[PDB]
Design a protein around this ligand. Structure first.
Ligand code: PLP
Ligand code: PLP
Ligand code: MG
Ligand code: MG
Lengths: 383, 384
């Protein structure tokens, strides 16, 4: 780990060995103990249910976190939303990459078809039979093999096909196409993941499972039984795991957590951040103005995070409240005037994935010290 | 100059100079260089016609190259920066006059601030707490540099700054007395009113801010601390500061690029300011990557390619399709006529330019269908 050329407080927030009080704000810290407990717990859950877990790299965009998910959580590989992101993971040594998305632009397809030359195994999703010919041609050009998932729109309304006939058509084309292998089904119900009610989420996944089952049966009737039936997120994984239809999970956010996931309820009606998953990702911020008696202004505003899923909150205390932000300022209510200039706070971000994607580093803290500083390997890699 | 050898199109840069616009990799940010230059000239000409300095705000674009264009074509007198690390990026890029339009309190940040004049930059910083003066002076003394001081007034935005003329005078006196500091004037930015729809509502808010600033100027003058600069103003207010007789420096930022949330506010003729006053120069370029449903297209620019803090982007230059939804790596475009095909490209006007610029590392400057420039977002992610 050589950080030569970097400058703390200019292009990196900290270096291994620093005390946490020396970290430059605003930045992202990882509670390494809690991260590791989250990773172990999901890996144990998947194993106990006979499920593969392909950890989702779109969330943290970090080769180092993915390697920890593989070593400590038994993750079988990484999921990626974009080809450039996939390539960042493959260049970092990740050996099994699933692009949980469609790739259609010719230069993107060419880059995808080259990726296996890194030594990584590569699978991609398809929702348009016309895409098969392009992928096959590119794989033939580079002398590579690509795996194919057919993506089913099982309720999220994004990409994917909506009938079992469409699924069979794409799978048949994949099987017949040179240098492609039909590997199974992508069916991620992303739209239901943040419903507060466990029973509501169960009902949505019940419907997805029934649709996926019709597709599995149609494929089996054609001699194209899907090796993998892959999906599931931090708000649903128990349902895919109990289904006997899915055999691979794609959970991402559980490792870090955020406020929007944290507030949804488990089967007992308890917030999932109050027992199921721990907060491991925080924005560290400093108070930099307090001219009014009961308002503190901190240095983490919009550009240090996102607000697509609401505001962050101050972690570990309930006497102050993050209520507003502009681009480079956050306004924290301080009704008892207990915050002072240069005090530090930890914020749980509203939404982990976009927050991670506006930073270049994670400061991994343990026992009050900076133990690791990990690059956000795939930040901004949306091509 | 930029060295592109470390980068790779389609992996960590969207394009290279000389490419055809059809070859640009999506999602990315493009700048219509003609429109950008017309916006920059127009603001510069407006400022000069009103005898105002314009200090272009670098927090918006975070680009040394755009700032240099604002100086060369718009007559910008210098840059505004919101954070010390952003200021360091601009000073290291050769920008000669840097105002940090924010307070700097953390000791290591102050130490970094105090070294910035060694780049050749003149450096000014804002103060809203008299106790900050001693820390700034100590660092400047330690490193043999000079720092200028603006006292920040909360003139209605309710962010940083002080709210009494007595507090202003106290800070200014301390700056004047402190070694290696010089009291340079007032920071008074009414950011909260900038996006009110009604020009009349905006005028009234700035009337109140001007009155408060004038009282502070009067109090300073009575103490022998007349402010050399009285600086503020944004893209939604600049005509008020420019006709106030009190402000002498503007800090407009967004006008150069524009976005949807600014574009929708109305001018004194009841028109959207993006329908006459300022042109759209910043676009998100995006490709259709799925069309499995007959009347929906999915594009490759979602939340991670922009922001939604100020609402959705919109499709520019056509009326037959509509960006209605986005997830992290997808945008959903209504296509009720079924005219969009996979790999078609669309230009989106971002909802909010500043946060959108801060999630990308490059601007693809296009002119006459070609990539003329590829400029780095010099200060992306520099929030320290
Ligand atoms: C983002 C994503 C996941 C992981 O989702 P979480 O809700 O973050 O756990 C899984 N599958 C796909 C296809 C995704 O896009
Ligand atoms: C952002 C900002 C400006 C410029 O704002 P626009 O509304 O984008 O033109 C000016 N002054 C300060 C202090 C700012 O923070
Ligand atoms: Mg998410
Ligand atoms: Mg703005």
């Amino acid at each position: 780990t050589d950080f030569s050329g970097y400058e703390v407080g200019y292009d990196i927030p900290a270096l291994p060995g620093m005390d946490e009080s020396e970290i430059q704000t605003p930045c992202l810290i990882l509670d390494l103990d809690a991260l590791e407990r989250n990773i172990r717990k999901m890996g144990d859950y998947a194993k106990a249910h006979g499920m593969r877990h392909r950890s989702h790299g779109k969330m943290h965009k970090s080769v180092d976190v993915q390697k920890l998910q593989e070593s400590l959580g038994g993750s079988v590989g990484v999921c990626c939303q974009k080809v450039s992101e996939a390539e960042a993971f493959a260049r970092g040594g990740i050996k099994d990459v699933l692009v949980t998305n469609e790739v259609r632009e010719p230069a993107k397809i060419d880059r995808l078809a080259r990726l296996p030359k890194t030594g990584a195994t590569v699978t991609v999703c398809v929702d348009d039979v016309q895409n098969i010919a392009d992928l096959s041609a590119a794989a033939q050009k580079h002398g590579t093999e690509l795996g194919i998932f057919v993506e089913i729109d099982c309720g999220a309304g994004r990409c994917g096909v909506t009938t079992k006939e469409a699924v069979v058509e794409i799978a048949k084309a994949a099987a017949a196409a040179p240098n492609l292998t039909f590997k199974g089904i992508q069916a991620y119900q992303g739209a239901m993941q943040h419903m507060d009610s466990f029973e509501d989420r169960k009902a949505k996944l019940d419907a997805a499972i029934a649709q996926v089952k019709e597709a599995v049966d149609a494929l089996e009737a054609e001699g194209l039984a899907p090796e993998f039936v892959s999906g599931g997120g931090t708000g649903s994984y128990y349902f895919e795991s109990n289904s006997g239809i899915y055999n691979e999970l794609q959970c991402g956010s559980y490792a870090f957590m955020d406020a929007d996931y944290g507030r949804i309820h488990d089967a007992e009606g308890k917030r999932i951040d109050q027992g199921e998953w721990e907060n491991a990702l925080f924005i560290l911020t400093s108070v930099m103005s307090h001219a009014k008696p009961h308002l503190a202004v901190v240095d983490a505003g919009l550009k240090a995070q996102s607000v697509d899923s609401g505001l962050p909150f101050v972690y570990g205390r309930d006497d102050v409240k993050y209520i507003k932000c502009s681009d480079e300022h956050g306004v924290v209510e301080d009704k008892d005037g207990v915050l002072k200039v240069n005090d530090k706070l930890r914020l749980v971000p509203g939404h982990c994935d976009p927050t991670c994607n506006v930073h270049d580093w994670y400061v991994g803290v343990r026992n009050g010290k900076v133990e690791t500083v990990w690059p956000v390997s795939a930040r901004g890699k949306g091509y």
